[PDB]
Amino acid sequence: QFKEKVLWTAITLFIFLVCCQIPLFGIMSSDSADPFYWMRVILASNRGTLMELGISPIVTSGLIMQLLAGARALFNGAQKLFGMIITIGQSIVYVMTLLITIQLFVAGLIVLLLDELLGISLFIATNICETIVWKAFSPTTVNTGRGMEFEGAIIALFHLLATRTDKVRALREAFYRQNLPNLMNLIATIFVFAVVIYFQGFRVDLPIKSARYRGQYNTYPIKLFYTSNIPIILQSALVSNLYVISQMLSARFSPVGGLCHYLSPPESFGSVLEDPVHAVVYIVFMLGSCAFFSKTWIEVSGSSAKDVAKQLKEQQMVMRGHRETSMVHELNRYIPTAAAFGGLCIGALSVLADFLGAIGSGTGILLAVTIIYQYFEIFVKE
Amino acid sequence: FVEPSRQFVKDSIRLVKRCTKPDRKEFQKIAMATAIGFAIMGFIGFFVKLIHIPINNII
Ligand SMILES: C/C1=C/C[C@H]([C@@H](C)C/C(C)=C\[C@@H](C)[C@H](O)C[C@@H](C)O)OC(=O)CCC[C@H](OC(=O)/C=C/C(C)=C/C(C)=C/C=C/C(C)=C/[C@H](O)[C@@H](O)C[C@H](C)O)[C@@H](C)C1
């Protein structure tokens, strides 16, 4: 454990707050922060170095060295150093278009220690969970064209209701504002959570009587999101946030609005704008490409139908249906459809986190609920 | 080459009529679980903007 499961997250909280700090190697505007702007929901949130390329380049550099070795203590030790030199080598060009070494080294090593002795997604989960409260508690601005010091948020309307009368105009201003966090917008990020936490609990149930035990019904759940919102929304973000900043960079080294007719997630309340074919092509991307990512993810990441029969048979578990090996086909009528439709319906519920518009871009705001569920299962497990 | 898509959509509607559904109790249970898990990590950014505006006033 009880103290350990709070203590490890307290260490991770403190190393996410001390790596929520800006460098002091020179101050500019958002010019070197435009490529890192679209990677805000990738690892962490600054317009500067905070947790740039911390823990996932360690793993992908491990994948590169595994690929070289294919086509333990020394390997795991060189993991941290090879994954730590590359973020400094990329911060070289991030400066050119010193502090980060011990920072991202301990940011890698602490979560490596709680993943080995005792949390990559917890960073993005905290990044979204701060964002929902920041866009709900925003009293911090210099006085704009309306308000006292306020952004139209919840505590802003709380301290604005007693000083401003005429609630009839105030309700329409609080329902039809399009540049700030609104009041009709925060009910959409509760609607998307109450819908996706209902779609999370869709699952298919299969019976298992374990071998030489008369009637222990350890049933096996095949979820709708068989593939947690992790390995599909991460793929949508990893194609989108890289193609966007590459179209930023190459257009200025050799277009932002010249090629936006297939790129932009629309965040307008009147969504039948001047390019209604763009919404169609965007919905075809945000369904088909991510569903293809899911259907190609099952056949790689060890949880296909023909491999889950091996994981069932190694545990001395058998179905209560036909034969010792027809358990493959007795669930292969359910696995590829719960990968394909399980990748399509999550894309539709990421579309309807933007078509309505809930708190954000439909990517981190919909992928944060799977980390809440994935840590709920840890909390209920042990 | 549209009959495979017809096969996919009839298989998906055959799937979601087979799945079990959270109706009224487990829905509220998992909603309370994600509400308390969101209320844990939500107020940490609130404490970040509590700690930081004295520090932003200083620097
Ligand atoms: C970055 C990352 C993380 C994943 C997890 C990660 C999410 C999990 C995680 C966070 C930690 C893991 C590593 C540890 O397990 C954690 C501890 C607790 O265990 O990891 C892992 O890399 C495992 C899986 C490997 C992942 O490949 C993919 O995802 C690959 C995807 C694609 C698009 C493949 C295709 C289709 C290529 C195209 C092929 C073509 C065209 C072939 C041709 O036709 C050819 O036949 C003929 C020609 C003519 O000659 C890695 C690369 C991804």
Author numbering:
A (entry chain A): 27 to 97, 109 to 134, 149 to 169, 178 to 313, 337 to 464
B (entry chain B): 7 to 65
Paper excerpt:
Protein secretion in eukaryotes and prokaryotes involves a universally conserved protein translocation channel formed by the Sec61 complex. The structure of the heterotrimeric Sec complex is conserved throughout evolution and contains the core channel-forming subunit Sec61α/SecY together with the smaller subunits Sec61β/SecG and Sec61γ/SecE (Van den Berg et al., 2004; Voorhees et al., 2014). The translocon forms a gated channel that maintains membrane integrity while selectively opening to allow passage of the unfolded polypeptide chain. In addition, the translocon must open laterally to allow the transmembrane helices of membrane proteins to pass into the membrane environment as they are translated.
To understand the mode of inhibition and provide insight into the molecular mechanism of this dynamic translocon, we determined the structure of mammalian Sec61 inhibited by the Mycobacterium ulcerans exotoxin mycolactone via electron cryo-microscopy. Ribosomes were predominantly translocon bound, and particle subtraction and focused classification on mycolactone-bound translocons yielded a map with an overall resolution of 2.6 Å and local resolutions for Sec61α from 2.4–8.7 Å. A model was built containing all transmembrane helices of Sec61α, the majority of Sec61γ, and a poly-alanine helix for Sec61β. This movement of H2 and H3 away from H7 and H8 results in opening of the cytoplasmic side of the lateral gate. Comparison of the structure of the mycolactone-bound translocon with those of eukaryotic primed (Voorhees et al., 2014), signal peptide-bound, and Sec62/63-bound states (Itskanov and Park, 2019; Wu et al., 2019) reveals mycolactone to stabilize a conformation of Sec61α most similar to that observed in the presence of a complex of Sec62 and Sec63. Because mycolactone must be present in the translocon to account for stabilization of this conformation, we docked mycolactone into this density. This binding pocket lies between helices H2 and H8 of Sec61α, within a hydrophobic groove created by opening of the lumenal side of the lateral gate.
